[PDB]
């Protein structure tokens, strides 16, 4: 009949426009945001312990580099050690070669740092852009320091032109997880979190499940983006001139219906992925990071290669607002799990032709 097919099209479009364009109502958006916040939470929870600054070329290059996290700010030193008496040493991790199951190079660390700052600054200054939207441009700042030749420490803030679209931000998150996953740098030993008391063990030994979890959340979130654009360029049009059989020919009617089914399957696939992100978050957030990634209050934990601006800082726990976004994913998915009957009528209605 006329308005039956026409009403089913209006159900798909309104649901698709909410799923693609919406923020707080969209489980596609909130799952993407969860994956982004989870990697920020991962690094905030255990990033300080990652051993960096092993040499690439030579032991003769005793390169160091300080990486800055700003507020109660902190600074992480790659390359150096601290001597028995407590003084800083320019000979430390940089005496030993950087590779798998040992130590990140300064280069590998500066990628993690740069991506982290891009991701963190983008979500705070602009938020995640809607998945159908192409994004909004914004500058990101990355502060680091090097030691000058027998003299003072030089600070340097870089500018990075970046966007807040999902595809970009997911790439930043992917850089952090894959660098930890692929090269398994060792953790520093010694308000110490439970997992650290993880001293003579690499980061993949302590967080293998958590890296795999985050890794999958990113890949599933990237797939949601690719289905959302496919969905967006697959809109079934309303039937107009309902009895004009020359205009509304039984060819275009079968084509419209097959456009509705591909539109329907994309929506099903997105919600499937969104649940798997929620599944993968439970794997991430129930191991060593259970009492950490979800929360944020000012601790005072310190390793020998960290200096802090006061006696506070926020290392040890996530500080990404993951619990907020987890419930928002559930609340949005509940709305979409109630409208699944209206979708199922629209699938059956199209299959008839």
């Amino acid at each position: 009949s006329a308005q039956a097919i026409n009403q089913a099209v209006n159900n798909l479009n309104e649901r698709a426009k909410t799923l693609a364009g919406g923020t707080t109502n969209s489980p596609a958006y909130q799952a993407t945001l969860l994956a982004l916040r989870s990697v920020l939470g991962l690094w905030n929870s255990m990033g300080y312990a990652v051993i960096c600054g092993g040499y690439t070329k030579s032991p003769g290059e005793n390169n160091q580099k300080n990486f800055h996290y700003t507020d109660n700010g902190t600074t992480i030193n790659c390359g150096g050690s601290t001597n028995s008496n407590g003084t800083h040493s320019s000979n430390g991790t940089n005496t030993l070669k950087a590779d798998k199951n040992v130590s990140l190079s300064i280069e590998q660390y500066e990628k993690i740092h740069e991506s982290y700052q891009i991701l963190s600054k983008a979500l705070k200054q602009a938020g995640l852009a809607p998945l159908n939207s192409k994004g909004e441009k914004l500058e990101a700042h990355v502060t680091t320091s090097k030691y000058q030749q027998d003299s003072q420490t030089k600070t340097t803030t870089s500018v990075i032109d970046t966007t807040n679209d999902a595809q970009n931000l997911l790439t930043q998150a992917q850089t952090i997880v894959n660098t930890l996953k692929d090269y398994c740098p060792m953790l520093i030993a010694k308000n110490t979190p439970s997992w650290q008391t993880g001293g003579g063990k690499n980061s993949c030994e302590t967080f293998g499940a958590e890296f795999s979890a985050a890794s999958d959340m990113i890949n599933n979130a990237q797939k949601i983006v690719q289905e959302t654009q496919q969905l967006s360029a697959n809109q079934p049009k309303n039937i107009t001139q309902p009895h004009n059989l020359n205009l509304n020919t039984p060819s275009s009617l079968t084509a419209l219906a097959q456009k509705m089914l591909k539109n329907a399957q994309s929506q099903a696939e997105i919600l499937k992925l969104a649940n798997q992100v929620e599944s993968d978050f439970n794997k991430l957030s129930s191991g060593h990071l259970k009492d950490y990634i979800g929360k944020c209050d000012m601790s005072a934990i310190s390793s020998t290669n960290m200096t802090m601006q006061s006696q506070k800082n926020n290392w040890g726990n996530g500080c990404a607002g993951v619990e907020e976004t987890l419930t928002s994913l559930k609340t949005s998915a509940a709305d979409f799990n109630n409208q699944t009957p209206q979708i199922n009528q629209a699938q059956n209605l199209a299959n008839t032709l």
């Binding site: 032991p59 000979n91 060792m186 390793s303």
Partner: protein
Amino acid sequence: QLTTESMPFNVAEGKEVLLLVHNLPQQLFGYSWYKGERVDGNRQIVGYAIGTQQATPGPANSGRETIYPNASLLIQNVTQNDTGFYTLQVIKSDLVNEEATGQFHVY
């Protein structure tokens, strides 16, 4: 405190010497041996990471050295050039280091 001991101290040319390490910390990130008095990357004999057990040689590596998990350094077919000070830097799991020097003479 960390301590070297060369065995023997007075070494005949073409023979071998073992630098024993006493009071080695039980929790280690890694360590490195050096030619001479001080920790100098240009005179690194070899670096050893505990995670991989990779004895990565350095610029001072003659090819006649063998390093062990107990931080000991065997040197075989000792030449007259091998005389003098050696330096061990050890790096603990908490990123704190301990230095120790040793020495042997060759005749």
